[PDB]
Amino acid sequence: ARAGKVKSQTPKVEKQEKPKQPKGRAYKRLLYTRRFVNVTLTNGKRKMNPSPSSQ
Amino acid sequence: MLIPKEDRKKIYQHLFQEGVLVAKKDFNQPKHEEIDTKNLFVIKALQSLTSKGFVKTQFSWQYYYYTLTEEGVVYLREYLNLPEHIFPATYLAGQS
Amino acid sequence: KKVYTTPKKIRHKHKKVKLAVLNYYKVDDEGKVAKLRKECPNCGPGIFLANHGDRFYCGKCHSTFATQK
Amino acid sequence: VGENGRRINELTLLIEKRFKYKRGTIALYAERVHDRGLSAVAQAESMKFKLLNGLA
RNA sequence: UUCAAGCCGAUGGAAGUUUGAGGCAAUAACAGGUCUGUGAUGCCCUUAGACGUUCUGGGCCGCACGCGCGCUACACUGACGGAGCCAGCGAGUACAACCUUGGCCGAGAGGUCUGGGUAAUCUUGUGAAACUCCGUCGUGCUGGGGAUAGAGCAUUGUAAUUAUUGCUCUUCAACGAGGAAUUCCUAGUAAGCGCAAGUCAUCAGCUUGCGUUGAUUACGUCCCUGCCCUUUGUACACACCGC
RNA sequence: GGGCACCACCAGGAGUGGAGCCUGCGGCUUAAUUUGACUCAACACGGGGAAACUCACCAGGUCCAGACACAAUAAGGAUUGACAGAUUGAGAGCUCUUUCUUGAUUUUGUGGGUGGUGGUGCAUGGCCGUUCUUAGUUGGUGGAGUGAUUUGUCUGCUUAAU
RNA sequence: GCCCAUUCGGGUCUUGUAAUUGGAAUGAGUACAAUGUAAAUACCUUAACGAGGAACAACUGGAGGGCAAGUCUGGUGCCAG
Numbered sequence: 158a159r160a161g162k163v164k165s166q167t168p169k170v171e172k173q174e175k176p177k178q179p180k181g182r183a184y185k186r187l188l189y190t191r192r193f194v195n196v197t198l199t200n201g202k203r204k205m206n207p208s209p210s211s212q
Numbered sequence: 213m214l215i216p217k218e219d220r221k222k223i224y225q226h227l228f229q230e231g232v233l234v235a236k237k238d239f240n241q242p243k244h245e246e247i248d249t250k251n252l253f254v255i256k257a258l259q260s261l262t263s264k265g266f267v268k269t270q271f272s273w274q275y276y277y278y279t280l281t282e283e284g285v286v287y288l289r290e291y292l293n294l295p296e297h298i299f300p301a302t303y304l305a306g307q308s
Numbered sequence: 309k310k311v312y313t314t315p316k317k318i319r320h321k322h323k324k325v326k327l328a329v330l331n332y333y334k335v336d337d338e339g340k341v342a343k344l345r346k347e348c349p350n351c352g353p354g355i356f357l358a359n360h361g362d363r364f365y366c367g368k369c370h371s372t373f374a375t376q377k
Numbered sequence: 378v379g380e381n382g383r384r385i386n387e388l389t390l391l392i393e394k395r396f397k398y399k400r401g402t403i404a405l406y407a408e409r410v411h412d413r414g415l416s417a418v419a420q421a422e423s424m425k426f427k428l429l430n431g432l433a
Numbered sequence: 434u435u436c437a438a439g440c441c442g443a444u445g446g447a448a449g450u451u452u453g454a455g456g457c458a459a460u461a462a463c464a465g466g467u468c469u470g471u472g473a474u475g476c477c478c479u480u481a482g483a484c485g486u487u488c489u490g491g492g493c494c495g496c497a498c499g500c501g502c503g504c505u506a507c508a509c510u511g512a513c514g515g516a517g518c519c520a521g522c523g524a525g526u527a528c529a530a531c532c533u534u535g536g537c538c539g540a541g542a543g544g545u546c547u548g549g550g551u552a553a554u555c556u557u558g559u560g561a562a563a564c565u566c567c568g569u570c571g572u573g574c575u576g577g578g579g580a581u582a583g584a585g586c587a588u589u590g591u592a593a594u595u596a597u598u599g600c601u602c603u604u605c606a607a608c609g610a611g612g613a614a615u616u617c618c619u620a621g622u623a624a625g626c627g628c629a630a631g632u633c634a635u636c637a638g639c640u641u642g643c644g645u646u647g648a649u650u651a652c653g654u655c656c657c658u659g660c661c662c663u664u665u666g667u668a669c670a671c672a673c674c675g676c
Numbered sequence: 677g678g679g680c681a682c683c684a685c686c687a688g689g690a691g692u693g694g695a696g697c698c699u700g701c702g703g704c705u706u707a708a709u710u711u712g713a714c715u716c717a718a719c720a721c722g723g724g725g726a727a728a729c730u731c732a733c734c735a736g737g738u739c740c741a742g743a744c745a746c747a748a749u750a751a752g753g754a755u756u757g758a759c760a761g762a763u764u765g766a767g768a769g770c771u772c773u774u775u776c777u778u779g780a781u782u783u784u785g786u787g788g789g790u791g792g793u794g795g796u797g798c799a800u801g802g803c804c805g806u807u808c809u810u811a812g813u814u815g816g817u818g819g820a821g822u823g824a825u826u827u828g829u830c831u832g833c834u835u836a837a838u
Numbered sequence: 839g840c841c842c843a844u845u846c847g848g849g850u851c852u853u854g855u856a857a858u859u860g861g862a863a864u865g866a867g868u869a870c871a872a873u874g875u876a877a878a879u880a881c882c883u884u885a886a887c888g889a890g891g892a893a894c895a896a897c898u899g900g901a902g903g904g905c906a907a908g909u910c911u912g913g914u915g916c917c918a919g
């Protein structure tokens with residue numbers, strides 16, 4: 158089309174029934190854990206949202 | 213693919229005896245070395261085998277090379293009848 | 309490239325007109341058998357002649373008769 | 378090597394088939410390379426492997 | 434020659450041009466070529482009456498005509514006959530059919546029998562040509578020149594007409610050294626001359642090499658052409674096919 | 677301004693360009709006269725001297741070489757074969773005449789591959805050509821700049837050559 | 839973290855993950871009451887019921903840089919954005 162062709166063309170994938178990421182302070186706690194407590198692995202450098210290791 | 217089944221059987225037997233197979237990449241060739249069948253037919257058979265696992269194929273220098281995996285060997289045995297403690301080239305015959 | 313020519317007439321491989329339990333051979337008594345047409349002279353019995361208007365052949369030797377029967 | 382004569386044996390057989398030889402007249406041996414880094418082909422192969430794997 | 438780098442000349446020396454000739458040959462690139470060397474390959478196309486394959490007959494070779502490598506000649510430093518008669522690179526078959534001497538047949542091409550060679554051994558001294566000698570034509574589109582032509586004889590292959598090539602006779606065209614232009618070249622080079630393998634069943638005017646004959650003129654310069662740097666100027670940076 | 681080079685010119689040679697003929701490439705022609713490449717760095721180049729093959733083009737025919745997955749027939753045949761002449765360019769079963777063989781290979785679909793001298797070298801690899809076989813290129817200190825950078829790598833004279 | 843690291847491993851001590859499960863609250867809701875109040879509401883106070891992923895459920899914007907955070911997967915292919 159020549160008026161929002163792309164929105165109509167895509168396949169609608171459905172929201173997966175995943176568990177709630179808890180609200181308020183819980184989230185903050187989780188974030189903290191992710192950051193400073195657990196300490197993510199680094200070959201040389203830190204990274205917040207890593208990739209599946211590939212090109 | 214259109215094989216007189218006897219020929220196919222013979223080919224299989226030969227393969228079993230070997231533990232290996234070397235073919236040309238030469239279609240139109242009337243009869244293969246060793247086996248008394250068309251080379252093309254043999255090649256086709258090998259291809260088929262590869263498609264259902266079994267054989268490992270290399271196409272280098274107008275010469276197809278073929279070796280049997282354990283599963284392939286088992287399949288061959290089944291096709292034949294021969295039970296256990298048999299030829300291929302998975303182990304030596306005696307001392308060589 | 310250049311466009312394809314398009315006369316029209318296509319020819320396919322014939323499906324063969326398969327037929328089994330064919331009306332050749334017979335039995336009248338029950339115990340013994342009564343062969344229809346004839347068997348091959350060149351090859352052994354079991355193979356049967358093709359019957360036409362003074363023309364015969366057989367398929368195991370692709371097609372190799374001449375004499376009538 | 379494989380597991381005490383297998384892959385090597387197969388290779389030998391293949392060779393024989395190719396070049397009309399008899400069993401005994403071909404003898405394969407699989408040896409180590411004295412310093413891999415000095416070799417070039419090996420290095421290239423390694424690089425290729427790495428690429429295949431998916432590395433920076 | 435600031436008596437440096439070097440260069441120039443004699444002497445000796447096989448060699449005094451980087452001793453000659455090449456082989457390799459940096460950084461950065463080019464939208465240069467090759468996806469028709471490639472089971473090197475992305476993606477697209479196609480994908481069982483294929484744009485796959487495979488047979489059969491053609492076609493790449495057609496001709497008002499342009500340019501580009503080339504060969505053959507415009508003869509007397511020749512042509513034609515005899516006679517003399519000397520190279521170097523090579524290459525060459527047993528599962529095929531290679532080079533093929535030597536003997537007989539044939540004007541030739543080419544046939545045949547026989548060998549020798551898997552090769553410093555045999556082909557092969559590849560007694561190659563251009564050359565050299567004595568004779569025949571003498572400066573006439575002539576015996577220069579050999580094209581187009583017709584016929585037959587050969588060979589290769591399954592197949593030779595759209596002459597494959599060779600040979601035999603016959604036909605004798607254009608062209609008396611080529612305007613504007615422009616290529617190549619500095620020594621065993623240039624040019625001539627043939628051989629040689631490559632492709633190849635058969636075809637050399639091609640090609641990579643080879644040797645034979647063997648000069649003229651510089652041994653300089655930036656006039657042209659290109660390229661290189663330096664200094665300059667720049668509204669350019671996809672960079673003058675620019676903006 | 678200063679260099680260098682017979683792919684520049686001088687001093688000369690041999691030439692080509694003219695002639696005929698070979699062969700490339702255009703243009704036209706042609707069913708089709710397959711394609712790649714056009715200043716040097718396209719044009720006796722593709723090792724490209726094509727008789728078929730090669731071959732990609734055309735006119736025509738043949739063949740599956742449709743791997744594998746999954747169902748429709750599953751022997752009351754899946755499909756394989758097939759002398760005889762018409763058929764056919766044609767001792768191509770190419771088929772329509774035929775009524776014998778062939779035995780679960782197949783084959784009819786649906787996933788899925790495979791091949792392509794099909795395309796795009798301005799999507800790539802490798803190789804090659806060309807700038808250039810010219811004399812060019814770089815970085816470590818140290819100095820000049822805030823800096824991009826620069827100097828080294830240069831007036832001169834030498835050399836084939838930073 | 840480690841008593842010891844002939845190989846283990848107990849795990850004696852401490853942390854995170856499982857539609858396990860279990861005990862202990864909770865007020866957001868409702869609701870006698872009493873409070874408030876001019877009268878009411880609502881607040882504060884209480885009895886009683888009311889949580890287990892199906893709820894007694896947090897949205898908004900962004901995820902190349904500026905600028906915190908995806909060279910994830912498909913759909914698109916100068917389009918629509």
Ligand SMILES: [Mg+2]
Nearest residue numbers: 311312313314
């Ligand atoms: Mg066609």
Ligand SMILES: [Mg+2]
Nearest residue numbers: 451453454455
């Ligand atoms: Mg030298």
Ligand SMILES: [Mg+2]
Nearest residue numbers: 553554557558
């Ligand atoms: Mg000799």
Ligand SMILES: [Mg+2]
Nearest residue numbers: 574575578605
């Ligand atoms: Mg004359």
Ligand SMILES: [Mg+2]
Nearest residue numbers: 637639720725
């Ligand atoms: Mg040639």
Ligand SMILES: [Mg+2]
Nearest residue numbers: 683716717806
């Ligand atoms: Mg040049």
Ligand SMILES: [Mg+2]
Nearest residue numbers: 494699700724
């Ligand atoms: Mg040609």
Ligand SMILES: [Mg+2]
Nearest residue numbers: 502639640720
């Ligand atoms: Mg040339």
Ligand SMILES: [Mg+2]
Nearest residue numbers: 597636726727
């Ligand atoms: Mg030819």
Ligand SMILES: [Mg+2]
Nearest residue numbers: 469791792793
């Ligand atoms: Mg191909």
Ligand SMILES: [Mg+2]
Nearest residue numbers: 468474792794
């Ligand atoms: Mg391709």
Ligand SMILES: [Mg+2]
Nearest residue numbers: 464465466797
């Ligand atoms: Mg390119």
Ligand SMILES: [Mg+2]
Nearest residue numbers: 464465797798
């Ligand atoms: Mg290009």
Ligand SMILES: [Mg+2]
Nearest residue numbers: 817818819826
């Ligand atoms: Mg510095």
Ligand SMILES: [Mg+2]
Nearest residue numbers: 826827828829
């Ligand atoms: Mg500098």
Ligand SMILES: [Mg+2]
Nearest residue numbers: 897898899900
């Ligand atoms: Mg969101």
